[PDB]
Amino acid sequence: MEMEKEFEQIDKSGSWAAIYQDIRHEASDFPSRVAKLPKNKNRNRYRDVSPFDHSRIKLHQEDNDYINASLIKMEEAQRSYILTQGPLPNTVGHFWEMVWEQKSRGVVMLNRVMEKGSLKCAQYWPQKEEKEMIFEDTNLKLTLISEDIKSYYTVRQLELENLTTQETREILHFHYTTWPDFGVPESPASFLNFLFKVRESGSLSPEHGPVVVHCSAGIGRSGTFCLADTCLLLMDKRKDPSSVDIKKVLLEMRKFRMGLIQTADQLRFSYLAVIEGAKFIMGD
Ligand SMILES: CO[C@H]1CN(S(C)(=O)=O)[C@@H]2CC[C@@H](O)[C@H]1C2
Ligand SMILES: CO[C@H]1CN(S(C)(=O)=O)[C@@H]2CC[C@@H](O)[C@H]1C2
Q: Which amino acids bring their CB within 6 angstroms of ligand 1?
A: 14-17, 264-265
Q: Which residues are catalytic?
A: 215
The tally of CA atoms less than 13 A away on the side-chain side of residue 116 is 9
Residue 230 vs residues 204, 224, 254: alpha-carbon distances, Å: 11, 10, 13
Instruction: Tell me the pairing of strands 153-162 and 167-176.
Output: antiparallel
Q: Is 20 in the pocket of ligand 2 (CB under 6 A)?
A: no
| DSSP secondary structure letters along 134-195 | EETTTTEEEEEEEEEE-SSEEEEEEEEEETTTTEEEEEEEEEE----SSS--S-SHHHHHHH
Binding-site residues sit at 181, 215-221, 262
Q: Which one-letter amino acid corresponds to residue 115?
A: E
Burial class (CB in 10 A: 0-12, 13-18, 19+), 279: exposed
Instruction: Tell me the pairing of strands 211-214 and 79-84.
Output: parallel
Handedness of CA 221, 222, 227, 228 (dihedral sign): positive
Chain centroid to CA 237: 22
Answer for the pair 108, 225: CB distance below 8 angstroms, yes or no: yes
Give residue 56 CA to ligand 2 midpoint distance, Å: 18
Ligand lying closest to the C-alpha of residue 265: 1
- Closest ligand 2 atom to Cα of 140: 1
Binding-site residues for substrate sit at 181, 215-221, 262
Which residue owns the Cα nearest ligand 2 atom 9? 138
How far, in Å, CA of 199 to CA of 117, rounded?
Answer: 32
Give residue 61 CA to ligand 2 midpoint distance, Å: 6
Burial class (CB in 10 A: 0-12, 13-18, 19+), 149: exposed
Residue 150 vs residues 177, 178, 193, 247: alpha-carbon distances, Å: 9, 11, 12, 33
Which residue owns the Cα nearest ligand 2 atom 8? 61
Q: Is 162 in the pocket of ligand 2 (CB under 6 A)?
A: yes
248: closest CA among 7, 18, 8, 22? 22
Report how this structure was experimentally obtained: X-ray
Phi-psi region of 183 (alpha: psi -120 to 50; beta: other; left: phi over 0): left
Domains of the chain: 1-284 (3.90.190.10)
How far, in Å, CA of 107 to CA of 212, rounded?
Answer: 5
Which residue owns the Cα nearest ligand 2 atom 16? 60
Q: Which one-letter amino acid corresponds to residue 27?
A: A
Phi-psi region of 209 (alpha: psi -120 to 50; beta: other; left: phi over 0): beta
Q: Is 160 in the pocket of ligand 2 (CB under 6 A)?
A: no
Answer for the pair 19, 264: CB distance below 8 angstroms, yes or no: yes
Q: Which residues contact 78 (CB under 8 A, 6 or more apart)?
A: 206, 233
Give, for 265, the enclosing helix (H) or strand (E): helix 264-281
| DSSP secondary structure letters along 62-77 | SS--EEEEEEEEETTT
Handedness of CA 145, 154, 121, 87 (dihedral sign): negative
Residue 60 vs residues 67, 82, 94, 100, 281: alpha-carbon distances, Å: 11, 16, 10, 10, 40
The tally of CA atoms less than 13 A away on the side-chain side of residue 141 is 14
